[PDB]
Structure 1
Amino acid sequence: EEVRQFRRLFAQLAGDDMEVSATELMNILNKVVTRHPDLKTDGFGIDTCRSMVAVMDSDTTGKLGFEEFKYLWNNIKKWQAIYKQFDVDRSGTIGSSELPGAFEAAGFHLNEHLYSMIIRRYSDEGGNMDFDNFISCLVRLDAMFRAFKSLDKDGTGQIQVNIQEWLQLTMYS
C-alpha cells in the first residue's frame, strides 16, 4: 500500500533522530526536482529549507515529524501539479500573468496589491518565478493563512498579538 511505503520513506529520510531536518529536506527535494527538468529551478537552498521547516514545525521540535512532513509533502505534490498546469507557455516557470491562476487553483485568493508584493519578493527581474521559489512561497503562504485563522477562531477579521507572539510568528519562518 502507498501509505505504508510513504511511512517507510519518511523513516528512511529522517534517519537517526527520526525527524526530517532542513538539510535532510533540502537533499530529498533537490534529488527529486532533478528528475523533472520541466521544472526550472536553481535548486532548493538551505536557507529556504530552514524557512519551510520552521513554518511547518508546529510542535516546535526544530524538525519535521511524520505528520508535519506528510502534510508538507502532499502539499508539494499538489502544488507541483498546479505549477505545470498553469505554466501554459512551458517556460518551466510561473510567469507574472500565470501566477493569479496558479495561486487561486491552490486555494489562495489574494488581491492585486498582495500579488504584486509576492512577485517583488519571489519572482525574478522579469516577473518569473521558478519552482523552488513557487513552492517555498506557497508553503509560507499556507502557513501564514493558518496562523491567522487559528488566532481568529470567531472570524472577526483581525488578530491581536503582543511583541513576544509577534516575534515568534515572524522570526520562526
Structure 2
Amino acid sequence: EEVRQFRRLFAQLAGDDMEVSATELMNILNKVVTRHPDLKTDGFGIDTCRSMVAVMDSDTTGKLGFEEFKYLWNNIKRWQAIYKQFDTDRSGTICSSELPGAFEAAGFHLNEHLYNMIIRRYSDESGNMDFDNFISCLVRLDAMFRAFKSLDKDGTGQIQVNIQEWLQLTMYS
C-alpha cells in the first residue's frame, strides 16, 4: 500500500516538473495541518517554506526531488508525533518547559544557552512555540548538524572555512 501510495501523492503534489517547489510545499503543509486541530498554527508562510526547501535541496535544483521530499516528509511525520506527545497540557503548543523533552526525543541535546536562543527566535512572548515554528526550527536544526558533520568527518568538533564556503553554508538556508 504505502510505498505506492506515497509515490502517488509525491507525483500529484510535484506536478509537471516532477519536483516540489516551496509553494507546492506550503500548500500541502497547510492543507494537512487543517486536519489536525491539535496542532495550533497561524499557517506555514511562503518564506518559511523557501527556507525549508533551500535547506533540503542537496542537488541545488531549487526544488525538492523525490528522495529530498521523502526525507523531509518522513522527518515532519516523526516530529509531528513528538509534538503531540510532549504537549502534556494539550495547549496545542510547546512551551519552554516542554521543549527540551521534545527536542531530546528528536535526538538533539543542546545546552541551556542554545535552548534560550531558540526560544527567543521561535517562541512567542509566553515562551510558547506553535507547530509551523517548531517544524521550521527542527528542519533547520537537523540540517545544520548534518552540514557541520559533513565537513567534520573525524569528529574534531571544528570545521575550517573560507568566505565563499561560509556564505554558501549560511545564505543557502
The answer, yes or no, to whether TM exceeds 0.5 is: yes
Q: Which one is further off, 3-12 or 24-33?
A: 3-12
Is 1:41 aligned to residue 41 of structure 2? yes
Deviation at 1:120, TM superposition (A): 0.4
TM-score by length of 1: 0.99
How far off is 1:92 after superposition? 0.3
Per-residue CA deviations over 1:7-40 (Å, capped at 9, x if unaligned) read 1110110001110000000000000000011100
Give the distance between the partners of 2:27 and 2:42, measured in 1 at CA: 14
Identity of aligned residues (%): 97
Q: By how many angstroms is 1:89 displaced?
A: 0.4
Give CA deviations for 1:82-132 in whole Å, capped at 9, x if unaligned.
Answer: 000000000100000000000000001100000000000000011000000
Q: For 2:165 and 2:93, how far apart are their aligned partners in 1?
A: 36
User: Which blocks of at least 5 consecutive residues in structure 2 are unaligned?
Assistant: none
- CA deviation map 1:108-158 (0-9, x unaligned): 110000000000000001100000000010000000000000000011110
Q: How high is the TM-score relative to the length of structure 2? A: 0.99
RMSD: 0.5
Deviation at 1:66, TM superposition (A): 0.4
- Structure 1 stretches of at least 4 aligned residues deviating more than 2 Å after TM superposition: none
- 1:71 Cα deviation after fit: 0.4
| SS of the residue 1:160 aligns to | strand
Shift of 1:67: 0.4
Q: What corresponds to 1:160 in structure 2?
A: 160
1:170 and 2:170 equivalent? yes
1:118 matched to 2:133: no
Deviation per residue, 1:69-92 (Å, 9 max, x gap): 000000000000000000000010
Q: How many equivalent pairs are there?
A: 173
Q: Which runs of 5+ in 1 are unaligned?
A: none
SS of 1:132 mapped into structure 2: helix
Distance 1:100 1:85 in 2: 13
Counterpart CA distance in 2 for 1:93 and 1:41 is: 8
Q: Distance in 2 between matches of 1:162 and 1:83?
A: 38
**CA distance in structure 2 between the partners assigned to 1:41 and 1:96 by the alignment:** 17
Separation in 2, partners of 1:151, 1:142: 15
